[PDB]
Amino acid sequence: MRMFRVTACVPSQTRIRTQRELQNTYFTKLVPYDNWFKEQQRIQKMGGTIVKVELATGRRGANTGLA
């Protein structure tokens, strides 16, 4: 299935992480196509600066066979 290689840093603005709830924000992550719209919207909702979006798997203009 066609994948997105996405690097983004999503900051927290509504919670203070005490010592363990802190995880990371600068993630590079392979994203499936059918979820990337919702992941882009989610990390835009939380307030993340998306610095790098490329097509990891699949080609451009695929009429079929892309999944």
Binding site: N63, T64, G65, L66, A67
Partner: protein, 156 residues
Amino acid sequence: SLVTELILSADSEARYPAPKELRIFQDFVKTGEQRVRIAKALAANEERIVQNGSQKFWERCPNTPSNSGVDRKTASCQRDQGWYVRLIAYSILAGSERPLEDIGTVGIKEMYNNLEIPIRNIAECMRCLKEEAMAVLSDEDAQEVAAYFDLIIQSL
């Protein structure tokens, strides 16, 4: 297609093609001659299929943008009918409805609502084209084509 779906089903449990998958592949390759015959027939007679389907669809449903007096709308409807029967030809060639699904029948409702075209009118028209596809094809040919025509029907 059938091959890609069989591979990704083999890919999912990280394994080789199982005793059934090769069997389905052999069935597909040996029914390939029949599938190519269906595709050749459809590509040869698409013009009269579209004409007869539009004839029956306007005798049946006339309150359509297809016959609202604008010739551009009618020509667009004929082109859409030819496109969908070409996608059915792609489906019978591929052995699976995924050329139909990935091109014609996934975003179909949102798109044809955006065009302000009534969805059930397109369903009626696809039923007309399916009936004429019966009218020109042999029994197995028309059964395999009616498969994907009812895929288009379900997507609407």
